[PDB]
């Protein structure tokens, strides 16, 4: 057994949607995709869920940031400061 880099997986890109300190994400994979995040406060408040059924989800993003992992697609990151004026 060797450390080959398999030609490997990739899940379709997400639909990013803005709200006030909140990411609505209409999402639509090919296969069951383990999504997960890390609210970068010292309060981690992570989430995990395999997604195979297309699902609009939500994420209470904080002031300092959140990150977002659409499958083995690379991890995203997001500034959600205010939007409530």
């Amino acid at each position: 057994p060797v450390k080959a880099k398999c030609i490997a997986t990739l899940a379709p890109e997400p639909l990013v949607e803005h709200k006030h300190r909140t990411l609505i994400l209409h999402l639509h994979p090919d296969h069951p995709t383990l999504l997960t995040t890390r609210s970068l406060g010292s309060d981690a408040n992570p989430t995990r869920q395999w997604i195979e059924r297309p699902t609009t989800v939500n994420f209470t993003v904080t002031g300092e940031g959140l990150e977002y992992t659409w499958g083995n697609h690379p991890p995203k990151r997001v500034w959600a400061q205010e939007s409530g004026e």
Binding site: S42, P46, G65, V78, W79, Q81, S83
Partner: protein, 400 residues
């Protein structure tokens, strides 16, 4: 002029402080902590992996017993058995019918995947954090050097000597006990070398890959082969490395706090944005410009024109520059309210040049130090609309 500065630990954004040396012209900083890779002190305690019941081929004495001995193989399970009639290619071959004896033996051994696909425990201490700090300094305009955090280490790469930390935010996102797998790192209370219950994680526990000795609590129990046929019932828990790959927990690069990323590399935890770092630099005095050569800018005026109450450098402000000479003029807001994109502004003889910035207070009353000339750029700002992209440049939220 050894410019001490408390400094927030946050990776992807410069920290353009200002050198207020009494006597010569000030110089801006641009300190971008491009990385916060950690590399705690650790110890390889034991690799684990899934077993392989690589059965040695059983003995079959045809008429009478064959006592087994406890060979020193890891988890060497061996049990004599009688009452067989072993069908092997010619029907049976041993002519007795109860004195037909069969001695099954099986030991546990590292898989071939153990070398390569293997979890890996650690006792993790704190160690010492690092960074490839870029400073596009002053007029030097470049140094991208790897540094430490311990508050007496310089790194004379470029021309400047810089001392960092120790940081106050000692949260090692790694716990004391950690399991590691390929790239997914698990802050797991692995039981220990030498103990792991069969089926549970660490049923196989080898010190390293080379280590011929190990601990194999697999509950390997041989049973007698059936109805006078040659084979080896090995009844065994599939590994706690088999599970731990599909009934596991989530990775620390997906559950950590305070903003870290991970690698199976020196076991760093990159970019952990938390707390502050007391950083202090000894600039090369040659890089200074004497005060009598930069234009004096006073008798000026500053005002916002479209302040954006935001993260991206949306805040702007014209400045009625009132110079004496003409040239460059480093700039900074000594108040942390306003973070400015421009370190330096060019000046003709008393012109005007807008800069960009970002704030967090509706009424930004921040001083601006245009190369030894302070000014309040008071005003009012507007909220944006479009907030779903990576991390800010503002990082200055307070009471507003």
């Amino acid at each position: 002029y050894e410019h001490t500065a408390v400094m927030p630990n946050k990776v992807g954004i410069p920290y353009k402080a200002l050198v207020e040396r009494p006597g010569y012209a000030p110089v801006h900083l641009q300190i971008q902590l491009v990385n916060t890779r950690i590399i705690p002190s650790t110890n390889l305690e034991y690799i684990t992996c899934k077993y392989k019941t690589k059965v040695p081929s059983p003995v079959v004495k045809c008429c009478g017993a064959t006592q087994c001995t406890s060979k020193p193989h890891p988890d060497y399970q061996c049990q004599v058995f009688t009452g067989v009639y072993p069908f092997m290619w010619g029907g049976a071959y041993c002519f007795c019918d109860t004195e037909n004896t069969q001695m099954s033996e099986a030991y546990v051994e590292r898989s071939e995947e153990c070398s390569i696909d293997h979890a890996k425990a650690y006792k993790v201490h704190t160690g010492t954090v690092q960074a490839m700090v870029n400073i596009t300094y002053g007029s030097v305009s470049w140094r991208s050097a790897d540094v430490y955090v311990n508050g007496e280490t310089p790194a004379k790469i470029g021309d400047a000597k810089l001392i960092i930390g120790p940081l106050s935010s000692a949260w090692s996102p790694f716990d004391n006990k950690v399991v590691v797998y390929g790239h997914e790192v698990y802050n797991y209370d692995f039981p220990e070398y030498g103990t792991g219950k069969a089926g549970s994680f660490g049923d196989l526990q080898s010190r390293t890959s080379t280590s011929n000795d190990l601990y194999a609590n697999t509950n390997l129990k041989l049973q007698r082969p059936q109805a006078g046929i040659v084979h080896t019932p090995f009844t065994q828990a599939p590994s706690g490395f088999e599970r731990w790959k599909r009934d596991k927990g989530a990775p620390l690069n997906d559950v950590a706090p305070f903003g870290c990323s991970i690698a199976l590399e020196p076991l760093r935890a990159e970019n952990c944005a938390v707390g502050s770092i007391p950083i202090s630099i000894d600039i090369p005095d040659a890089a200074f410009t004497r005060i009598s050569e930069t234009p004096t800018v006073s008798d000026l005026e500053c005002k916002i024109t479209e302040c954006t109450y935001a993260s991206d450098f949306g805040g702007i402000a014209t400045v009625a520059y009132k110079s004496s000479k003409a040239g460059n003029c480093p700039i900074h807001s000594p108040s942390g309210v306003a973070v400015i994109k421009e370190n330096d502004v060019t000046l003709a003889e008393s012109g005007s040049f807008t800069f960009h910035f970002s704030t967090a207070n509706i009424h930004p009353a921040f001083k601006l130090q245009v190369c030894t000339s302070a000014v309040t750029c008071k005003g009012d700002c507007k909220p944006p609309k479009d907030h779903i992209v990576d991390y800010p440049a503002q990082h200055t939220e307070s009471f507003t």
